[PDB]
Design a protein around this ligand. Structure first.
Ligand SMILES: [Ca+2]
Ligand SMILES: [Ca+2]
Ligand SMILES: [Ca+2]
Ligand SMILES: [Ca+2]
Ligand SMILES: [Ca+2]
Ligand SMILES: [Ca+2]
Ligand SMILES: [Ca+2]
Ligand SMILES: [Ca+2]
Ligand SMILES: [Ca+2]
Ligand SMILES: [Ca+2]
Ligand SMILES: [Cu+2]
Ligand SMILES: [Cu+2]
Ligand SMILES: [Cu+2]
Ligand SMILES: [Cu+2]
Ligand SMILES: [Cu+2]
Ligand SMILES: [Cu+2]
Ligand SMILES: [Cu+2]
Ligand SMILES: [Cu+2]
Ligand SMILES: [Cu+2]
Ligand SMILES: [Cu+2]
Ligand SMILES: [Cu+2]
Ligand SMILES: [Cu+2]
Ligand SMILES: [Cu+2]
Ligand SMILES: [Cu+2]
Ligand SMILES: [Cu+2]
Ligand SMILES: [Cu+2]
Ligand SMILES: [Cu+2]
Ligand SMILES: [Cu+2]
Ligand SMILES: [Cu+2]
Lengths: 172, 172, 172, 172, 172, 172
């Protein structure tokens, strides 16, 4: 047992390791999306930039969790970062919809993690999740929702003009 | 034989003279395109600006080759710069497609030149082509590809609105 | 076939996809190492900083390859990023030795990729590997070699004092 | 007929197209001269710089005419840019003499163009030629005359010392 | 075998040691030339400055090769730096001609080294030679060629006035 | 006999030529030492920097002597720069000890040169040696002595830790 370990349940330690992997997975999904929009037959550079930014945001999310694991005296056990479910993301709208779904999945995991922290009477871990993750999730979900709505109302994905104009006026 | 000449095959010297002409030809094509978009019945000033820039880029490509010829002790023999295949470039999309085709043709010539340099064991010439030309070609081809894709997806060439908006939002 | 694709063999495209994965793997190994030195029972913060820097360097290596894939009209196919071979990296010296081994493995892959590019007469790809990868590898390998030597001569890994002083005087 | 076309004779339109070609030809002659002085067995870098400058001056002359063609609702029809009459320009003095001859030929063409504009009662075209071309010609001819005189009086082309000193003291 | 050594043939290592010596020799030749022009009975201080600069350029060439040897895990074995073939360099023109000959000899050695690297499938070494040496050679050879031409055309070496004026107007 | 020559004995001229060679030799020894510490299996970069600095100091020593030779109307006759006595310098301490020995040898030569100048009643040469060389020698010898002492007292060469710490705290 670590010299720093105090009030840190083995279940919480395991849950943190799982969340680390999920954040790294989310980062990979966004990296995949970024380079899809970099394709010569897609060519939406601000979509590419947007998802690249999201990829690095997820990387920071993974960082804070790995730091937390060591702070609490838990031990980091990394797992494979699974390849994303798609190679071809179809369109700007589809990518935004897939991102929205991803963020709701990540949020669900974090809410489960918060419940576990509460159940194990770990207020430090509970507050860590609240302070650094829960509102970040809500903000991300709202933003992606907003983006999906605009694209749909503009005529995407059928209208290539819509996706082009959104790339220029919202993501640029 | 020039006092500076060393490891420079007569075939390479001839190939360099041909490439000089091709770069000057490419510059002329782009100049032609530039002024097509300057026409009162076309009036796409950022298309005009874009192709004008490309024309001067090609001029620099010709410069470096003429400099190389003299550096290696070869002798510059200029030929006619042939007029472009078209006087009327039809549309923004058609011009971009024609430019893409042109750049792939120029690239093919450079790849043949590189093969010749390799065959004649001329690593200086081989590296000159690699350093200053091959990636410039790849970058140009990718950019033009990106532009063609956007214009097509936006509804060009039938949509004059598409070409107008692309002129303003991508080339401006 | 992509509109931009020219002189780009399917074998090269596949090799590029494999290299993308290897660079992402290297980034993951370094991230793992970084947080090992962040442990309360290891506590070498400049080792942690050093490997974190290397992790982001590898991330950039992956970026340039993904960009290259799209530049040439190839298609990015991502695979799982495998977890590193170790969870516990033992010591500063062992981590440096493992990094050295990793870099020689990455270098071997790149040399094989260069040979393939040469065999397929793809001088653009050959020069891409030379310009952006081969010397970066040689520099990384030399640096890690230097670090291993210092640590060994100082008395690592048995001497915790040696690893502490190296952390402060070389990596700080 | 162009929506902008007014008082613009078809003969004038044709004459403008011919002048565009002549200006591009002059630019090519000067480019050829520039690189002749860049040869290792000539090596007069300020002669090279001087003619390069003249080449770009001619390029601007062609620009203004192409702009004029579109301004008036005429249509640009480009022709081959003929290679210069010489590959080897012999000496600094000979190049200056050839340039002088070229400029008098270009001037003759412009004076004929002005006469045509007057004959067709096109005062806009007449003034365009006067404002942007006629005095530019007179200035160029005088300058080249001055240069020829100096070189001759100094002992060129027999004196390589004369051409060297002129390169340094007048063109540098 | 060095811990860093990878894909580095013993023949290449030996060739690098030979090239190190040749670069140091070239530096010595230029140092000798520099001080010849410093003599009271020669007194061409800009010739002296020019060759001194070249001497330090060669010193840097030797540096990069010694660095390369260690980078690749080869071992530096230095040899005698042979005294130059002349003590008295006769004239500015003769020194420039001797320098031209020297640079073509150094270039020949580097081209042989490049061929060896290619034959041993060492693309890192091949690119090292291309990037840092081959064009530097071509540039040096062209410059010296230019200088020889000017001096000859001005009347050197018989004309002491020619050498004096060249010292002042080209090398100053 | 040079027009500038006055009170300059042929023996002094010869002695100066010998000293020029010795200073160049010293520069070569230090260059050799510098790159020994650049080896991946030595890796003491501040030792490398220190000896590199000393190498360029010796180069300046050679410069002043070559200048002196010409100032006095003597004639520079260069000889081979002999390779150093060692390829492998063993350790930081051994290199410092070898440098100390070298500097005492150079000093002995200069003291002999001073005696010759005195014997030939050449006060200019005597003062040249005093002003620019004798105290520089004493300073170099003292510094190297100081360095040897520190390394010995710290536990070098057996202690790799000692050499590492000296590299960081004295030479850095
Ligand atoms: Ca999987
Ligand atoms: Ca034709
Ligand atoms: Ca696995
Ligand atoms: Ca013709
Ligand atoms: Ca008027
Ligand atoms: Ca007027
Ligand atoms: Ca000898
Ligand atoms: Ca290359
Ligand atoms: Ca290269
Ligand atoms: Ca010897
Ligand atoms: Cu990134
Ligand atoms: Cu996240
Ligand atoms: Cu997220
Ligand atoms: Cu222009
Ligand atoms: Cu080009
Ligand atoms: Cu191009
Ligand atoms: Cu990071
Ligand atoms: Cu990498
Ligand atoms: Cu790496
Ligand atoms: Cu130009
Ligand atoms: Cu003109
Ligand atoms: Cu003109
Ligand atoms: Cu003057
Ligand atoms: Cu010097
Ligand atoms: Cu060199
Ligand atoms: Cu050189
Ligand atoms: Cu140096
Ligand atoms: Cu000295
Ligand atoms: Cu000394």
């Amino acid at each position: 047992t670590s010299q720093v370990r105090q009030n840190y349940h083995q279940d919480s330690e395991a849950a943190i390791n799982r969340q680390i992997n999920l954040e790294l997975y989310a980062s990979y999904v966004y990296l995949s999306m970024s380079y899809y929009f970099d394709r010569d037959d897609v060519a939406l550079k601000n979509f590419a930039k947007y998802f690249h930014h999201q990829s690095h945001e997820e990387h920071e999310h993974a960082h804070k969790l790995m730091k937390l694991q060591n702070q609490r005296g838990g031990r980091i056990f990394l797992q494979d970062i699974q390849k994303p479910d798609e190679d071809d993301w179809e369109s700007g709208l589809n990518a935004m919809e897939a991102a929205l779904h991803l963020e709701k999945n990540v949020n669900q995991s974090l809410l489960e993690l918060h419940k576990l922290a509460t159940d194990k009477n770990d207020p430090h871990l509970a507050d860590f999740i609240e302070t650094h993750y829960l509102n970040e999730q809500v903000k991300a979900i709202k933003e992606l929702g907003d983006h999906v709505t605009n694209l749909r109302k503009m005529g995407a994905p059928e209208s290539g003009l819509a996706e082009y104009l959104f790339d220029k006026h919202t993501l640029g």
